[PDB]
Design a protein around this ligand. Structure first.
Ligand SMILES: COc1ccc(/C=C/P(=O)(O)O)c(Sc2c[nH]c3c(=O)[nH]cnc23)c1
Ligand SMILES: COc1ccc(/C=C/P(=O)(O)O)c(Sc2c[nH]c3c(=O)[nH]cnc23)c1
Ligand SMILES: COc1ccc(/C=C/P(=O)(O)O)c(Sc2c[nH]c3c(=O)[nH]cnc23)c1
Ligand SMILES: [Cl-]
Ligand SMILES: [Cl-]
Ligand SMILES: [Cl-]
Ligand SMILES: [Cl-]
Ligand SMILES: [Cl-]
Ligand SMILES: [Cl-]
Ligand SMILES: [Cl-]
Ligand SMILES: [Cl-]
Ligand SMILES: [Cl-]
Lengths: 282, 282, 282
């Protein structure tokens, strides 16, 4: 980890210096929450590059931007653009933003993400509340707390059995009925895999047998350092596809079908998140 | 990854400069395909050292050599000597050769390897067609596509559900009957483990329960970058041993028994591969 | 690995130079064997810092010390203070001490450790003999033999199916009856996880389903290089806690409950280890 506490403080302070927005809720926007920044009243945009010590993607395609504003009368900081293991970032860079959020005094993290369905009852376009995760990289050493622990963030050995807030999740089932959606809001376990290649069938069978309902390539490191900092955490996945679980199928997973499911669910997801701000305790 | 596209191009071009052999098929020779170079008509040998940007083993024992020639009227490039995680090589070095093969315009990769039997119906000397793999290192971040993606090789998020060509595998069952072998050609799932230590019993039970038929320490990274480049992929394992699956046995696995099974199956394996060239589409 | 054989030799020799103690048995003291050094007759203490090439913890809290002496008429070298992946140490540093022990001509390693119960028949304060391990990090590349092999320590591909000595374990069940403990000495499989965060429920269910009886964050790398060097290996775990395996519980694991179970079992553990020296073959 090439970041000191002084580095985190510098970034927090610089942002406090450069905006009057004091946010309570951080949202990391995954697949098809691109345009959720269009619903922030009183939006102030930073490009990651301007923000100090802030990782910037080398890849030309994505210019990640941090946006401060109000959503449904909640002070929010949104991340449009995320860092993934598969891109080559170490986890002390992937999760750098969360430690800054805390130093802004944000108390709640919303995390969204795409995922393949491993639970057969799941369908494309479905939304799965993250109740638990399986951190497969963490088992092997790839945990974002690996290294010296700073008491000023949290304990050396934080628990995670409770990472995903029970209350937020109930209050999210309620909001669904109010949305009057045709399809029931799902609840399940998200397994993180590093990727970037899609799963084999033997691999998909391993993940289903380990007890995973969805597989994606993000979120878990962010949840772990959020819980390490004492943040309340709520997250869901967009079920972008059904993980091919048999050799008889003649169908390959693909990024296009993930972009598609993401453009298709944008409106629904943007709505659900903004109504949800109301159920976020102040 | 300390290799640019210009580096790969340089190696490809240098080889094109230094041989008139334009190969269609690359074969990576695992356990007991040492002498398969003796069956190349019109053989031109390179030591890895001569070949630019080509990883060279530090270990005194193995002087890896790349050999261009014809096998059963197929233009082949053979790798005699392979790079393994356990040796300390990063995967961008293990799989460096495959990216060069593609730049030579090779369209088909044959991958052979030793493996311990986890499926009880398997016996030493058996041959298992790789139908699927379980990439246990890949889950944790150790995937050879981790880092920036180059469009000139393939897509950022390639699928693998179809990695092992269906046609090649049928056409391989047919060739077996023509060989008139006493023992039926096997088909199964290969789990890669980094090693170099052999599995415990609890470990062997984990791998059987995950759905693996054989365990070895290679191949999978090569298959992933081959499929990333659009290469057709066919592979099998020599079942060198039966993974000790109970505490009551007084038998340890050992490298000697792997070298043995390899010397013992050489002839059979050398035959099977050369007949197989005929079934390789031009 | 930034250690040569000359480095290991230098450390061994320096210790031989600086003590008349020629030890047969190395003990790595885990949770609640702090005070086991108080039972060494004729104790000679080294701070790790004094000992050359010896890793030293950056963290202010723990000043690791190596102590030579006699326990129950056995020449022992004890490690008070251990190195863990979660602290950031690479495994060539975690296991550095074991290679030195061998060069002192120690023939037997005792390894102790805390662990969460995954087997429901287990209770806090219980003692589980390690019969086998599941090395989850090793699968992904994080094995301490990864790199060039030195013949002077052992074989490139050591077996582990037999890592935990059968005889020592019988002779340990016998000593239990002589101790006349109210609770039966347990026997099981220890899964290593890198941590430092505690397991989720989905995670705890994965580890139980893989066949693990206890989960801890140490030992396995030490056992692997000990067995690579030809050392006889015996180990047990203190069951510090029962891994939360359901969402209905309102209980988080915590370090305090691990320190507690450790202070509470110290006397019992200190006794068991010193009686055990008698059953150690000379
Ligand atoms: C491979 O293409 C991608 C690219 C990006 C993401 C997620 C980015 P995020 O929204 O978390 O910020 C995913 S997630 C994903 C959907 N379907 C699958 C699948 O079948 N397997 C494993 N993972 C996924 C997949
Ligand atoms: C440990 O000794 C070796 C050395 C080299 C190889 C493979 C080299 P390749 O032919 O892929 O290029 C193997 S593979 C192997 C056979 N039996 C087992 C086993 O029981 N467990 C896990 N793996 C193996 C094992
Ligand atoms: C998280 O806090 C710690 C700190 C140190 C250790 C071990 C050090 P050692 O004695 O091996 O030298 C453990 S081990 C441990 C007990 N309960 C659990 C649990 O529930 N999960 C996973 N692991 C543990 C846990
Ligand atoms: Cl930079
Ligand atoms: Cl990295
Ligand atoms: Cl890293
Ligand atoms: Cl070099
Ligand atoms: Cl490496
Ligand atoms: Cl590496
Ligand atoms: Cl130092
Ligand atoms: Cl490291
Ligand atoms: Cl490391």
């Amino acid at each position: 980890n090439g970041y000191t506490y002084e580095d985190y403080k510098n970034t927090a302070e610089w942002l406090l210096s450069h905006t009057k927005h004091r946010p309570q809720v951080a949202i990391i926007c995954g697949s098809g929450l691109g345009g959720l920044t269009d619903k922030l009243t009183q939006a102030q945009i930073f490009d990651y590059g301007e923000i100090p010590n802030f990782p910037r993607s080398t890849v030309p395609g994505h210019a990640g931007r941090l946006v401060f504003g109000f959503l449904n009368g909640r002070a929010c900081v949104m991340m449009q653009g995320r860092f993934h293991m598969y891109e080559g970032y170490p986890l002390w860079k992937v999760t750098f933003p969360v430690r800054v959020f805390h130093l802004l005094g944000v108390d709640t993290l919303v995390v969204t993400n795409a995922a393949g369905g491993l639970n057969p009852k799941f369908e494309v376009g479905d939304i799965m509340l993250i109740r638990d995760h399986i951190n497969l990289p963490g088992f092997s050493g790839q945990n974002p707390l690996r290294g010296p622990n700073d008491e000023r963030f949290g304990d050396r050995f934080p628990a995670m059995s409770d990472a995903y807030d029970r209350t937020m999740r109930q209050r999210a089932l309620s909001t669904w009925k109010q949305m009057g959606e045709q399809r029931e809001l799902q609840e399940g376990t998200y397994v993180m895999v590093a990727g970037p290649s899609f799963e084999t069938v033997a691999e998909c069978r391993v993940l289903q047998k380990l007890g995973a309902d969805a597989v994606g390539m993000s979120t878990v490191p962010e949840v772990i350092v959020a819980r390490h900092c004492g943040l309340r955490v709520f997250g869901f996945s967009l079920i972008t596809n059904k993980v091919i679980m048999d050799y008889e199928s003649l169908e390959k997973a693909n990024h296009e079908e993930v972009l598609a499911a993401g453009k298709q669910a944008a409106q629904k997801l943007e709505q659900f998140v903004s109504i949800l701000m109301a159920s976020i305790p102040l």
